[model samples]
Target: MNIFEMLRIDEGLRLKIYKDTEGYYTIGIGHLLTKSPSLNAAKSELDKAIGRNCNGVITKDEAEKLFNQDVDAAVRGILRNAKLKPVYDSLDAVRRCALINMVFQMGETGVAGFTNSLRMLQQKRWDEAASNLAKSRWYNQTPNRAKRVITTFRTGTWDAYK
Candidate 1:
């Protein structure tokens, strides 16, 4: 699958506002209401993405637009971390996509805390890297997606979900 499409599957599509795991109001594919993008400003773009008044519902195209920004922010956030930059640069496209999904789900700081895992990944210790993240609360919270992401890293495969 395409990178964006694969991430959309991991995130799942939700057209209406709902609380995510962290209790922040989320809509579409992992668009958080509270974050760097000011609530007022983000809301304006949100409505614009939907191309109309702030209706309670959104469509797939609107969702895609929101998701594009989220993914960009996630990548920028990951690259912003000095320690993470070298690690991210060393990764292959398949592995980088997994990192993007992780950074998207848990912000840069959250993934930044994965010191051992990142180190293992940087060293190309695929099994240890996969296992390190596998033992986390993240794995417990989102077993399936974590499994898929881990598999992507562990096997260096593009179709971990398949």
Candidate 2:
């Protein structure tokens, strides 16, 4: 069965994710904690956080140390909500939080907006996963970020950390 069939979502329910930058002269959405210009730096920090989270390197204590209350609030309250929960629950911890890193790069709204794409990933339909990921309105808008994410999701790695 198609992953979309598994998700029980019709095309009408499938909305391609899109975000309007509103003329912000920045590379990504959400607030920037680090002014890391190179894409490698940005993805490295995020992927490292995900890898650590996956490996239990960053336990609650470590997370608390690394993030302030607001950040924690954003991570817990904002990030782990309706949009992400399904995908999070469906996958193993690594893919779950790797997706969180994806959402972190693309905001809750941006990631949540990707109903079709998330379903694809949840069903382990890698090609559809990659296709839906690349079909983003924002992907066309933000080639660099989109390219990096698509590459990582497809090959299970990005040189950002290496």
Candidate 3:
């Protein structure tokens, strides 16, 4: 779940990441991936922002407004799954990264929408956890990237991610 891992520049992988109307790093899959440091930074920014706006409740539109800098907001937005049951109280390195990738592409609202999938992770259903990931619109929209992320989430192997 390294953020750099997601920002790889290689052949055969056609990733189109740019600023959207909201100015967030809109990925080819149609979500907000934090264009920042490590995935941890991204997630942390999101965690911090979650309670900052709207009396500890920021709207998706409000949150996306923070995408103006190379800060971790974008990255954290991707990792802050509304329904995530992190195996540990704090996210493990790889899981954080994986979650970061998911958040980046799905956004807080989009990720929060994946209630079943997050529950699957909470139950430790590895295959189902990974499988549920594919049921997302993002999976259909970006086959290569989604598959790669799911593979990493299931196997704990970063190889497929890059």
Candidate 4:
């Protein structure tokens, strides 16, 4: 329930889009936008959240509150990939968390693109699913992270990577 902690580990508190993650435009504690928000809108939201105009920076606490408010949005984002539901519900806790992490990294639409992986996961072909994950560009982009998630899927254990 503590987004602050998740943000701490999942994403370092950031002030700018230093680089893209899996080709997504990201900024401010792993905040991934489908498209860049209108400048005025981004500024207004930041100003309203922190009682100051956008400084292109947010505190850990601020990002935590913002993420808390939008946590349901993340869930809703994943729910948009309705086919993921049955597979999601069938996973054990560790595997479920792995899927959530994937959602965070790729968004619902992107996650949906993993059709074969999801099918293999639902079929409980753990090793096959992990192998499928290894065949992705995501794995090539972030092998350490993908390994952890893939291993979790295979073994049903949460082993933190980095």
User: What are the per-residue Cα lDDT tens digits for candidate 3 across 1-162?
Assistant: 346436332112213334544455433323344666444544455455444422212344443344323226545554453355353234456666676666555556777677787676666676998988898777887678788778767776677854
TM match of model 3 to true structure: 0.56
Pairs in steric clash, model 1: none
Steric clash pairs (candidate 4) = none
Estimate, for each residue in 1-162, the C-alpha lDDT of model 4 and write its tens digit: 232444346666677433456454445667753345455455555566667655556666766666665566666666666787888878777677778777776767787899999999999999899898899988998887678778878988655543
lDDT of 2 by residue, 120-142 (tens): 88788867788878776767876
CA lDDT, every model vs. true structure: 0.82, 0.50, 0.55, 0.69
> Which residue window of length 10 is worst by lDDT in model 2?
6-15
Off by over 4 Å in 4: 1-7, 15-17, 22-25, 33-52
> Candidate 1: where are CA atoms >4 Å away?
35-52
Residue 55 displacement in candidate 3 (angstroms): 37
**Candidate 2 residue pairs in clash (backbone atoms < 3 Å):** none
Q: Which candidate is the best by lDDT?
A: 1
Q: Per-residue alpha-carbon lDDT of model 1 for 83-146, expressed as tens digits?
A: 7788899999889888888888888888889999999999999998888899899999889889
Q: What's the true lDDT of residue 138 in model 1?
A: 95
Worst 10 residues of 1 by lDDT: 34-43
Ranking by TM-score: 1, 4, 3, 2
